Amino acid sequence: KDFEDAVEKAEKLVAMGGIGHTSCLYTDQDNQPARVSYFGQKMKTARILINTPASQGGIGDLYNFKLAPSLTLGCGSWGGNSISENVGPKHLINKKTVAKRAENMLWHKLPKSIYFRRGSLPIALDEVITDGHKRALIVTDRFLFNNGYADQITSVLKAAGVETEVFFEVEADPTLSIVRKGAELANSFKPDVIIALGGGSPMDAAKIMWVMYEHPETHFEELALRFMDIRKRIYKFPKMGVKAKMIAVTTTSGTGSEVTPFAVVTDDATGQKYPLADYALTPDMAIVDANLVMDMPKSLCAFGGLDAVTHAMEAYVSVLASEFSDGQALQALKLLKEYLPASYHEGSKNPVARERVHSAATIAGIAFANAFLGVCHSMAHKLGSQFHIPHGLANALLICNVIRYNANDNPTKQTAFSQYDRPQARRRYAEIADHLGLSAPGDRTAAKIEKLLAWLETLKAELGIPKSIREAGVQEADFLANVDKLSEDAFDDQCTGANPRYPLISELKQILLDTYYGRDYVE
Amino acid sequence: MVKAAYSSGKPAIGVGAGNTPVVIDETADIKRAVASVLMSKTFDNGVICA
Amino acid sequence: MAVTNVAELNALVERVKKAQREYASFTQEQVDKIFRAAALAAADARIPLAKMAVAESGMGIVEDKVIKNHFASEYIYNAYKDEKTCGVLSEDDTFGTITIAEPIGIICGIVPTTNPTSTAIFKSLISLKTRNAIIFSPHPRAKDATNKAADIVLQAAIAAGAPKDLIGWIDQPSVELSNALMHHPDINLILATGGPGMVKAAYSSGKPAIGVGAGNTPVVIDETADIKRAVASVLMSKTFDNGVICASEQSVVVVDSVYDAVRERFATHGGYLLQGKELKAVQDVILKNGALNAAIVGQPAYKIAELAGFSVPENTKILIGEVTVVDESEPFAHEKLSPTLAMYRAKDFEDAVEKAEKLVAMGGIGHTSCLYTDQDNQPARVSYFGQKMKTARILINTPASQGGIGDLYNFKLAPSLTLGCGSWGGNSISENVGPKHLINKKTVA
Amino acid sequence: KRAENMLWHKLPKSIYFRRGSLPIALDEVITDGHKRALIVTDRFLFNNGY
Amino acid sequence: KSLCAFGGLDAVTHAMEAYVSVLASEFSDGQALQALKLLKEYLPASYHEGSKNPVARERVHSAATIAGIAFANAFLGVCHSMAHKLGSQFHIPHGLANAL
Ligand SMILES: NC(=O)c1ccc[n+]([C@@H]2O[C@H](COP(=O)([O-])OP(=O)(O)OC[C@H]3O[C@@H](n4cnc5c(N)ncnc54)[C@H](O)[C@@H]3O)[C@@H](O)[C@H]2O)c1
Ligand SMILES: NC(=O)c1ccc[n+]([C@@H]2O[C@H](COP(=O)([O-])OP(=O)(O)OC[C@H]3O[C@@H](n4cnc5c(N)ncnc54)[C@H](O)[C@@H]3O)[C@@H](O)[C@H]2O)c1
Ligand SMILES: NC(=O)c1ccc[n+]([C@@H]2O[C@H](COP(=O)([O-])OP(=O)(O)OC[C@H]3O[C@@H](n4cnc5c(N)ncnc54)[C@H](O)[C@@H]3O)[C@@H](O)[C@H]2O)c1
Ligand SMILES: [Zn+2]
Ligand SMILES: [Zn+2]
């Protein structure tokens, strides 16, 4: 009685004899394009013939010139076949492939402008004035707002005629609860530039509230998913910068978060530190000036400067370490060898040493933005979030054992990478020990690692660092009850995938036990 | 035969039988649709598949 | 819910057949929502699924099943992220052809015991990508790890928009319950991975079956190779999950020009060269009754020597036996599924390929070979090796465990954990199985 | 008092490099919505398939 | 071979003038010295061999860009000022002019 009833009767006529062989349809194929697609969607055959005699049109190269000519017409898995096509010579081939080795594409991604000198805070802030920005949001710490550090930015900004607003309610660790508070302030103010004034946690909380202001429907449970490789991850970060730029003014001289695509934020429901890593979190401008670093106390200068040593030391031995980030990893260790003892003792009376340490933390930030950290920062994120040890103190205790852990000739379960030839972390640790001049002109490879370990054993001695985690204020009844949970949490903290060794969970608790009791790790 | 060709343990490329339901709606060419059915169904007295 | 015998098995397939025919009418847009959310929660549970598969079977390293469950959930998502499999694939206006994709239907899924949870992630993701269902029948040794792995993908898909019962699994397998599933009248495909006794059974039921076989991996290291690369890549891939992976390096063939330098590079590192009494003490522990015993499959290298009757150091990783004959009488020329090697010596490069041609004769006819040489300065040897070896994939300067599966070291092989061998080994694919093998392309001429 | 001139470190937004990363980097400019491209080459590089 | 020797010696002068310049800061001193370390060890190897030592032809192609990181932010000295005039007057190719 209708066209749509005729296809219904035809669907029951391919039910009795032959499930997916061949149907046919006669209509004007030019004036009716909606009926030739409804008939192709309903009929469960292998070939759909239109205005064609089915004997000459079922076989190929007649009336169509695009079907493959054959006299054995397949029906697919509807009729119990495995072709669903016309059988030709391409079904009897057994294709054999020869796959040669290729290397993973590396990169060197930085902010668009890294401005740095002694007093280049207002000269760099005049660039964001002339770019047409009229509404700015400034994310600071609570200490920096009460000490006039946030007033050095608002005085230059409001003198040119922009609308500023200061969010000064971040903590030492940027939990997720104080991020959605600033993201609620963001879309109620609608800024055009987010200035992340601060050293660590004020910058990591500003990068995530840059996401939730740009795309307010993103889930934190999908940002914190651990990938195996970037450019092949499941949750792609959306393209940001469509209504808000990011300026990154740093104050502490230990963390290069102004150039790295990292944002370590706490979940605040289970108490876990999650390093969120994708290159959409890179700021558009990093301002590293040493006028904000002069009045830094001695406890923050020693915690920061020893953290930036471990930044350039793990980015040099990593598997993603190429020739582009080996010069910056060694330059940041040359400056931190000569000036970090001078910047701690002399403090603010020796400004030319406080400036070089503040630059060497950012140069180390160039290194591990493109060649990520190893297993020392994977354990330091869990050790710092469990017992409230500040970041910079945690990885300073751990670095002397990870160097003895990674420097092995035949390690158990070396990692998989196409660029990484063999386990060669012991040679690259010896290339540091003579670039810094720590070695005599005649030495073996195993003797240069001892002079490297003896250097940062005295460097932590004259900087007020304790010898163990027990001397840092951790009870043995509390540490030994969580040393199995922290050894499994550090296995999947997304910095594990760049270590030269792929660590076992039994080996990661051996480093944590030998660092609490003050021993040295021996396999 | 398709049930027997896939019953021996070996990779098999089998094909089956089949009907061919034809739909001739109201906007078709009646002089083409009738003369093409008579040509293809009498082709070798309809021993051809499809 | 549970399935233990044939009376409620037919109630499981009839539940799946009802819920698949309303999933077969989905669009391209609302399948990519399901396929993304299923892979998003399958990589989230890479840690607990890896600890269950070692607690159940006890034949692997827990740290290696993490990056195998991660490979089966984010590399399978990345290659088939935007691939047309549901609606109109192509269309020609000058020739007048429309190519429409379809589903196949219910698929019998047969997982092995070596990869009990990673293939359950892989076969589930490529099934609901092509809008069809799958019924799992796990190995009885590791039945609880597979049924838990398919449950995380199912409960994440229903929250995304899938039907109520799309992925089913046999809760308690048997040799009769699995045979009753393969002879069911309303399933259409058998995705079956296992040994050579299973491929003969998967192609014996009257149904189109996509089977894969086992296989050796003869390695040819000629005189112009990188010795520091070739030794360090064999140790990485053979100790990857203690060699339970298909296409792991079961035997190497070194030329006589660099045979001594390769042995010294193996001896100073984690390899242990077996000498004299220890060589014969391990040849009677691998072949039990003319077949590979299940007591050494996936065990570490110090437990195989402990089962043989001596003691190696606890940190040794590869048991090397220098053998001479290429035959079925030598037990070291077989597939071992354990960190154990077999070093052969050849007098030339063209003699090393001849010994490698006889090493793909015993176990696995067309699975995987390998070759270590400089692929730029020697283009005539990479074409002579590709013409002589009758395998499905030829790996050059590549660890065979990470290089047999795709998207690692090559970026052009299709990533899959079911590696075909072609009609040499009694298969019908000769490729890596992806979502393009479960389509049933329909043309409109 | 003496002050110092503001220095900088300005680079391209992405510096992709390895042995064969020409088509893997060209897939980024495909997904950015670019539909019309102009390629400025030398006369030798056009006649030699580059 | 004529283009490999003209180019690789040009990139030596790129990293050597960007290291002694007055705009040379601590950010572009590591990249200026890294590009001279790679051009010392592989540029004789990349000229003699060529495509028979690809791992040496790759490091020279990377060391020219690492030197490009150096003089993008700390500009060249007086050697390239004379080489632009010496090369445009007598048609000496760039790379040969600043090498002399
Ligand atoms: N972005 C990254 O890639 C990255 C890398 C490492 C660590 N982090 C995160 O950052 C945190 C470390 O940050 P941090 O310790 O460098 O800074 P911080 O935010 O921890 O600052 C420490 C405290 O000192 C005060 N302070 C900050 N700057 C000061 C100054 N100039 N003068 C006087 N007092 C000052 C602040 O009030 C603050 O409470 C870690 O918790 C870690 O999670 C991020
Ligand atoms: N689409 C196509 O490719 C195509 C083409 C022509 C015919 N056909 C089908 O074939 C039929 C034509 O009659 P037919 O006599 O060729 O069909 P048939 O099934 O009787 O085929 C007979 C041939 O198949 C083999 N055979 C039959 N039963 C067998 C068994 N149990 N075990 C092993 N071998 C067996 C015999 O060797 C015999 O020569 C039609 O009904 C049609 O559906 C299909
Ligand atoms: N081709 C590949 O990519 C690949 C991948 C992994 C493993 N494999 C092969 O599989 C083996 C892994 O060990 P395994 O114990 O799984 O091998 P196996 O042959 O014992 O296979 C076990 C599975 O096959 C099924 N099976 C076994 N015998 C059967 C029969 N008679 N009828 C129906 N089903 C049957 C069972 O359901 C079981 O889950 C290796 O030896 C390897 O060669 C191949
Ligand atoms: Zn740090
Ligand atoms: Zn020049």
Author numbering:
A (entry chain D): 347 to 869
B (entry chain D): 198 to 247
C (entry chain C): 1 to 445
D (entry chain E): 446 to 495
E (entry chain E): 644 to 743
From the article:
Aldehyde–alcohol dehydrogenase (AdhE) is a multifunctional enzyme containing two enzymatic domains responsible for aldehyde dehydrogenase (ALDH) and alcohol dehydrogenase (ADH) activities. AdhE is a bifunctional enzyme having two catalytic activities responsible for two consecutive reactions converting acetyl-CoA to ethanol. AdhE forms long helical filaments called spirosome and this spirosome formation is critical for the AdhE activity. In addition, AdhE spirosomes undergo a structural transition from a compact to an extended form, in the presence of cofactors.
Here, we present the atomic resolution (3.43 Å) cryo-EM structure of AdhE in an extended spirosome form in the presence of cofactors. We found that AdhE stably exists as an extended spirosome form in the presence of Zn2+, NAD+, and ethanol. The cryo-EM structure reveals that AdhE forms a right-handed spirosome with 130 Å width, and four AdhE molecules make one helical turn with a pitch of 120 Å, which is consistent with the previous SAXS analysis on an extended AdhE spirosome. In one helical turn, ALDH and ADH domains from two AdhE molecules are intertwined to form a dimer, and two dimers make a tetramer by interacting with each other via their ADH domains. In the cryo-EM structure, there are clear densities of NAD+ in both the ALDH and ADH domains, and Zn2+ in the ADH domain. The AdhE dimer in an extended spirosome is widened by about 10° compared with the dimer in the compact spirosome. In contrast, in the extended conformation where NAD+ is bound, the NAD+ binding pocket is widely exposed. In the extended AdhE spirosome, both the ALDH and ADH catalytic sites are readily accessible to solvent from the outside as well as the inside of the spirosome. Furthermore, the interaction between the ALDH and ADH domains of two different AdhE molecules creates a channel between the two catalytic sites, which is located at the inside of the spirosome. Considering that ALDH and ADH catalytic activities mediate consecutive reactions converting acetyl-CoA to ethanol via acetaldehyde as an intermediate, it is likely that the channel observed plays a role in conveying the intermediate product.
